[PDB]
Design a protein around this motif. Sequence first.
Motif, PDB file in Angstrom:
ATOM      1  N   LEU A  72      -1.732  19.013  11.565  1.00 58.21           N
ATOM      2  CA  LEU A  72      -1.458  17.586  11.645  1.00 58.21           C
ATOM      3  C   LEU A  72      -2.062  16.994  12.911  1.00 58.21           C
ATOM      4  O   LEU A  72      -2.141  17.646  13.956  1.00 58.21           O
ATOM      5  CB  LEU A  72       0.047  17.327  11.612  1.00 58.21           C
ATOM      6  N   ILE A  93       0.510   6.544  10.076  1.00 61.41           N
ATOM      7  CA  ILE A  93      -0.810   5.916  10.103  1.00 61.41           C
ATOM      8  C   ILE A  93      -1.800   6.782  10.873  1.00 61.41           C
ATOM      9  O   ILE A  93      -2.952   6.950  10.460  1.00 61.41           O
ATOM     10  CB  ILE A  93      -0.719   4.496  10.692  1.00 61.41           C
ATOM     11  N   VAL A 104       0.886  -1.133   4.898  1.00 63.31           N
ATOM     12  CA  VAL A 104       2.293  -1.087   5.279  1.00 63.31           C
ATOM     13  C   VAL A 104       2.958  -2.360   4.783  1.00 63.31           C
ATOM     14  O   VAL A 104       2.490  -3.468   5.073  1.00 63.31           O
ATOM     15  CB  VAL A 104       2.464  -0.938   6.800  1.00 63.31           C
ATOM     16  N   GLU A 116     -16.716   5.100  11.421  1.00 63.65           N
ATOM     17  CA  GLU A 116     -15.752   4.010  11.486  1.00 63.65           C
ATOM     18  C   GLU A 116     -14.897   4.044  12.743  1.00 63.65           C
ATOM     19  O   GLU A 116     -14.556   2.983  13.272  1.00 63.65           O
ATOM     20  CB  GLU A 116     -14.837   4.031  10.258  1.00 63.65           C
ATOM     21  N   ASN A 153     -11.089   0.156   3.126  1.00 62.23           N
ATOM     22  CA  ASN A 153     -10.501   1.427   3.550  1.00 62.23           C
ATOM     23  C   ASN A 153      -9.586   1.119   4.732  1.00 62.23           C
ATOM     24  O   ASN A 153     -10.062   0.948   5.857  1.00 62.23           O
ATOM     25  CB  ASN A 153     -11.578   2.436   3.922  1.00 62.23           C
ATOM     26  N   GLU A 189      -8.026  11.737   8.467  1.00 59.59           N
ATOM     27  CA  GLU A 189      -8.562  12.329   7.251  1.00 59.59           C
ATOM     28  C   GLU A 189      -9.282  11.335   6.354  1.00 59.59           C
ATOM     29  O   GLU A 189     -10.268  11.718   5.713  1.00 59.59           O
ATOM     30  CB  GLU A 189      -7.436  13.005   6.452  1.00 59.59           C
ATOM     31  N   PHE A 190      -8.851  10.077   6.305  1.00 61.85           N
ATOM     32  CA  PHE A 190      -9.493   9.066   5.481  1.00 61.85           C
ATOM     33  C   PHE A 190     -10.503   8.218   6.241  1.00 61.85           C
ATOM     34  O   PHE A 190     -11.229   7.443   5.612  1.00 61.85           O
ATOM     35  CB  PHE A 190      -8.435   8.153   4.850  1.00 61.85           C
ATOM     36  N   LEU A 191     -10.570   8.342   7.563  1.00 61.08           N
ATOM     37  CA  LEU A 191     -11.516   7.588   8.376  1.00 61.08           C
ATOM     38  C   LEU A 191     -12.655   8.496   8.815  1.00 61.08           C
ATOM     39  O   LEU A 191     -12.420   9.560   9.397  1.00 61.08           O
ATOM     40  CB  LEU A 191     -10.832   6.985   9.602  1.00 61.08           C
ATOM     41  N   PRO A 224      -5.036   1.319   6.007  1.00 62.86           N
ATOM     42  CA  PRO A 224      -3.643   1.601   5.650  1.00 62.86           C
ATOM     43  C   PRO A 224      -2.947   0.355   5.128  1.00 62.86           C
ATOM     44  O   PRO A 224      -3.303  -0.779   5.455  1.00 62.86           O
ATOM     45  CB  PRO A 224      -3.020   2.070   6.971  1.00 62.86           C
ATOM     46  N   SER A 266      -1.690  10.070  11.335  1.00 60.56           N
ATOM     47  CA  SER A 266      -2.007  11.267  10.565  1.00 60.56           C
ATOM     48  C   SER A 266      -2.971  10.953   9.428  1.00 60.56           C
ATOM     49  O   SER A 266      -3.882  11.739   9.147  1.00 60.56           O
ATOM     50  CB  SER A 266      -0.725  11.901  10.025  1.00 60.56           C
ATOM     51  N   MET A 267      -2.790   9.811   8.763  1.00 60.97           N
ATOM     52  CA  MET A 267      -3.702   9.441   7.686  1.00 60.97           C
ATOM     53  C   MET A 267      -5.061   8.972   8.192  1.00 60.97           C
ATOM     54  O   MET A 267      -6.035   9.024   7.436  1.00 60.97           O
ATOM     55  CB  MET A 267      -3.084   8.350   6.807  1.00 60.97           C
ATOM     56  N   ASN A 268      -5.152   8.520   9.439  1.00 58.32           N
ATOM     57  CA  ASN A 268      -6.408   8.027   9.989  1.00 58.32           C
ATOM     58  C   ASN A 268      -7.337   9.136  10.459  1.00 58.32           C
ATOM     59  O   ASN A 268      -8.490   8.852  10.792  1.00 58.32           O
ATOM     60  CB  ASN A 268      -6.132   7.068  11.151  1.00 58.32           C
ATOM     61  N   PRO A 324      -1.375  13.227  -1.449  1.00 60.33           N
ATOM     62  CA  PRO A 324      -2.688  13.115  -0.802  1.00 60.33           C
ATOM     63  C   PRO A 324      -2.612  12.969   0.706  1.00 60.33           C
ATOM     64  O   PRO A 324      -3.639  13.134   1.377  1.00 60.33           O
ATOM     65  CB  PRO A 324      -3.282  11.859  -1.445  1.00 60.33           C
ATOM     66  N   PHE A 325      -1.441  12.669   1.253  1.00 58.93           N
ATOM     67  CA  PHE A 325      -1.295  12.495   2.686  1.00 58.93           C
ATOM     68  C   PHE A 325      -1.285  13.849   3.390  1.00 58.93           C
ATOM     69  O   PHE A 325      -0.786  14.837   2.846  1.00 58.93           O
ATOM     70  CB  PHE A 325      -0.007  11.740   3.001  1.00 58.93           C
ATOM     71  N   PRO A 326      -1.843  13.922   4.602  1.00 62.45           N
ATOM     72  CA  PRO A 326      -1.841  15.203   5.324  1.00 62.45           C
ATOM     73  C   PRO A 326      -0.450  15.709   5.660  1.00 62.45           C
ATOM     74  O   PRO A 326      -0.245  16.929   5.712  1.00 62.45           O
ATOM     75  CB  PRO A 326      -2.651  14.891   6.589  1.00 62.45           C
TER      76      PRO A 326
END
Lengths: 64, 182, 128, 128
Positions: free
Chosen positions: C30, C1, B32, C13, B28, C7-9, B30, C3-5, B146-148
């Motif tokens: 956001l 990164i 890039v 963690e 899990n 919701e997926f984290l 990111p 913004s995605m961290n 799926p991204f916020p």
Amino acid sequence: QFVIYSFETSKSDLEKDGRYKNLDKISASMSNPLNTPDHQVEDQSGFNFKDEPRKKFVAYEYWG
Amino acid sequence: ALQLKLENPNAYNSLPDDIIAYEKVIKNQPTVEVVNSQNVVIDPTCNGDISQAQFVIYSFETSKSDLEKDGRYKNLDKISASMSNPLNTPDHQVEDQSGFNFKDEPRKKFVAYEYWGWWDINGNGKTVPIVATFVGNTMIRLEENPFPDKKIPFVVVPYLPVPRSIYGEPDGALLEDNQKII
Amino acid sequence: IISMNSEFLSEEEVVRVTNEQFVTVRRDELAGEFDLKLSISTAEADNQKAQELAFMLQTMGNSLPFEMSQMVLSDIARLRNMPDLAKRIESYQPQPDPLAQRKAELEIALLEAQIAETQSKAIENRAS
Amino acid sequence: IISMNSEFLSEEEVVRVTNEQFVTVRRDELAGEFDLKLSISTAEADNQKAQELAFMLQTMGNSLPFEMSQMVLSDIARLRNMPDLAKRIESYQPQPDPLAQRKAELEIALLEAQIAETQSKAIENRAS
């Protein structure tokens, strides 16, 4: 006294804005990007979307 | 030891389970990566504003095991990875030249496509951001962003800016004649 | 990164990395758009930040309470890649000496005792 | 190397090198991925680290408790390849002088005695 801006937009953008009327009688055909000798599209190739909700046509704003 | 739990979670989790008193997430993180500009097709009409880009198509090279591991892909059986071949599509530019490919099915490399753009999915005139992944003629993934942030995950940075345009200009655009004369 | 961290984290963690209390972001908004300012960390930027922190520490001096000096010192220590020293400067809570407070209370009591004694002496002088 | 050294090295081998208490890493997780930051040790980097440690030591001064000064001094000594001097500065625990505490207690008792004596003197003045 007047400033006229000729931007390029689609029908979905106008629908999303919501403050536009007479959207049915627009057709986006004629109004074509590579179709008006006044607006200068920076596309050259003349790409355009096949689906209606994303077709790009040329509009005009009269801020005066 | 409770105060250790509120103040030092790292040391608290190192305690034996007795003192403390399924699907595992293996990876899990990111991802890039700078992509080849040949495999990206950005909307010609986005007048120098990735924000107002109606569609961006990325043609990456992947295997079947990667799609199986991701798990969010459907219609995997009707992919075949044959035709879809790396040294098989005149659009994707594989940096392999020799044309190496794995014999085993779970590791064969084929060419896929990602469609990171807007679409009218609700049939009401307005467009929403969607994600489409298709191989050959079959679509394997189709869903909203799926991204916020609900934005295309492609950052394009021009070197020498060109007004009302998305692509840049290298220093070599001014030194061709000088290089030739030298 | 960022913004995605958010919701997926999961919390287990983020706490694993930071070893601190997990700050939570609102639900339908956001992350880091309003209350965050991300930039590039260069050596010169860190040097200027340290020099400004030291200038602020000099400016406050002894006029302001030592709690804010603790914040400045902890920030200086954390910026210079010395996190353990910062967590100390932060965890340090100063406590007053009970003996000094007792001495002050006894001094006040003694002062009132002298006032009473002087009043009694004046009364005795009048009687005499 | 760090990740492989937390699984193939026993405690009796790490303690043999460090001669300290063996820190244990969690079970189902990589070692040093979260709470470690490995880089290249250059002479200039060590000089800058020492100069920043000295600047911090100057900054705290006498305002902060001497325990953190012990940490800073031990870090300076350990960084300059003087480990024995660091282990001393660390092992040193300061102890208060019992005579000074006794003197303070006797001073408080004497102050209360003077307060009582002044009160009695005022009472005697009223009686007179």
